[PDB]
């Protein structure tokens, strides 16, 4: 596809697809959980559910409109969807919710029922969803005392002390035209969207959001949440990685694809060309693992997550996995690098060429907000095809060899050994 950006006072981006049967229109702001403090942690999660509340959604469903929203660390989104010949109504609804009249939504009755609904989501998340809350605690110890540590949903202790005035203060400082991108995906022409905006003289708020004092800093650390009543052990482990607008962005993504993802109960996942699986399958040390490479405006993370029921062989799983990471600096084969090139292109093709216009609106707005434009998928494939074996060794010797780590765990983790027995496995030194 082909993107098209403009600036008439308002930044308008679009990605037309004539094959789609729908159209999405929305606005993406360049502020998220990393632009908050510990006192108001969760105020962006309440704006999501106020936008999706029942009396607001009822007004939309009478004209054939569906609503969505998403809160992350670096951005926030508010999308409206419609049939292709009804995109003029999508913009009017968005006009009387952000540019005008966001006081009818913050009434007393609408704010108390919404608050009670959010306190029950975050409570069930902390007691039932173990893989995702251990990955949240990883961000909280790795980036402690910096903005990138705060959870995106909020906490139960900070949510209870939020009143209406906290919602209005956060909007005056962040929902600004200088911090906003208007997006359009699916079956919508680029020129029909901009002329519709020019015929209304819209302006959210002018600009100059706050300054954000501290930068993100990685600290080697651990946090353990032991619970012997649960039936598994959930563990995550990472080093410091690459931010966006880094030269090593795609080299870190390719090195995670070398070790990849595993499911013990799927037969075809046991046959992948991954050397680590010859050690794990002898005694069945885990149920699943997945390797990630996450990237933000200021820093990143590189590592893996696992879940297991073999609570007596945890130390052999962590040991064998970290000995394969060492091979990226010493001994990594040309065959392993060509496999990972092909599967990474398939992974990026499914993410960017899905059918949903709502997913494409979130990717487009976040990219334009953070580098001014969007890289094509044909240009990204050429960068991936130009990575050599020497490039992986240079990246790993800087980022992996003899470097500090962050750890988080929950469940039956008595068999997870101390920090320094694990820190020592990051360098071979039988060498």
């Amino acid at each position: 596809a082909e993107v098209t950006q403009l600036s008439n006072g308002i930044v308008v981006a679009t990605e037309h697809n004539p094959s789609a049967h729908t159209a999405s229109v929305g606005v993406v702001f360049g502020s998220g959980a990393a632009n908050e403090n510990p006192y108001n942690n969760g105020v962006s999660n309440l704006w999501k559910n106020i936008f999706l509340s029942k009396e607001n959604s009822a007004v939309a469903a009478k004209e054939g409109l569906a609503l969505s929203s998403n809160i992350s660390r670096d951005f926030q989104s508010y999308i409206v969807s419609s049939l292709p010949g009804s995109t003029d109504k999508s913009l009017d609804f968005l006009n009387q919710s952000f540019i005008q009249q966001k006081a009818n939504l913050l009434s007393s009755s609408n704010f108390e029922a919404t608050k009670k609904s959010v306190l029950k989501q975050v409570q069930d998340f902390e007691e039932n969803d173990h893989p995702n809350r251990v990955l949240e605690h990883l961000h909280s110890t790795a980036f402690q005392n910096t903005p990138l540590s705060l959870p995106t949903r909020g906490t139960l202790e900070s949510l209870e002390n939020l009143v209406v005035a906290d919602l209005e203060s956060f909007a005056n400082n962040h929902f600004l035209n200088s911090n906003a991108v208007v997006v359009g995906t699916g079956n919508i022409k680029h020129e029909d969207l901009v002329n519709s905006i020019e015929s209304k003289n819209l302006s959210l708020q002018t600009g100059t959001k706050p300054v954000l004092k501290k930068k993100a800093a990685f600290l080697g650390s651990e946090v353990r949440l032991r619970d012997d009543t649960l039936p598994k052990a959930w563990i995550s482990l990472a080093v410091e990685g690459e931010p966006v607008n880094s030269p090593n962005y795609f080299v870190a993504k390719l090195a995670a694809q070398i070790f990849g993802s595993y499911n013990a109960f799927e037969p075809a996942s046991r046959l992948q060309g991954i050397k680590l699986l010859d050690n794990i399958q002898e005694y069945q040390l885990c149920d699943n693992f997945n390797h990630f490479s996450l990237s933000y405006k200021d820093s990143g993370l590189w590592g893996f997550s696992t879940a297991t029921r073999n609570v007596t062989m945890i130390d052999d799983l962590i040991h064998f996995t970290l000995k394969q990471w060492n091979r990226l600096t010493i001994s990594v084969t040309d065959t392993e690098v060509e496999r990972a090139k092909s599967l990474l292109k398939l992974q990026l093709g499914q993410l960017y060429e899905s059918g949903n216009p709502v997913n494409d609106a979130n990717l487009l707005g976040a990219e334009v907000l953070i580098k001014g434009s969007k890289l094509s998928l044909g240009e990204a494939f050429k960068k991936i095809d130009a990575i050599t074996v020497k490039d992986v060794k240079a990246w790993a010797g800087k980022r992996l060899w003899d470097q500090d780590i962050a750890i988080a765990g929950t469940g039956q983790i008595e068999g997870l050994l101390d920090y320094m027995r694990i820190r020592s496995d990051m360098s071979m030194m039988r060498w």
Binding site: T229, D418, Y419, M420
Partner: protein, 49 residues
């Protein structure tokens, strides 16, 4: 008869072992720093288990 060269080999032995004894203290404190500064906190579980 060994009095003179006994007290020469004793100067070397004591200087080498006194340096190894001070280096051992530094290495141990470095490797034990994670345990000494470790923190703990308790939150009573809710009575339903």
């Amino acid at each position: 008869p060994e009095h003179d060269e006994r007290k020469r080999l004793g100067l070397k032995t004591v200087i080498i072992l006194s340096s190894l004894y001070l280096l051992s203290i530094w290495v141990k404190k470095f490797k034990w720093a994670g345990i000494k500064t470790r923190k703990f906190v308790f939150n009573p579980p809710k009575p339903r288990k």
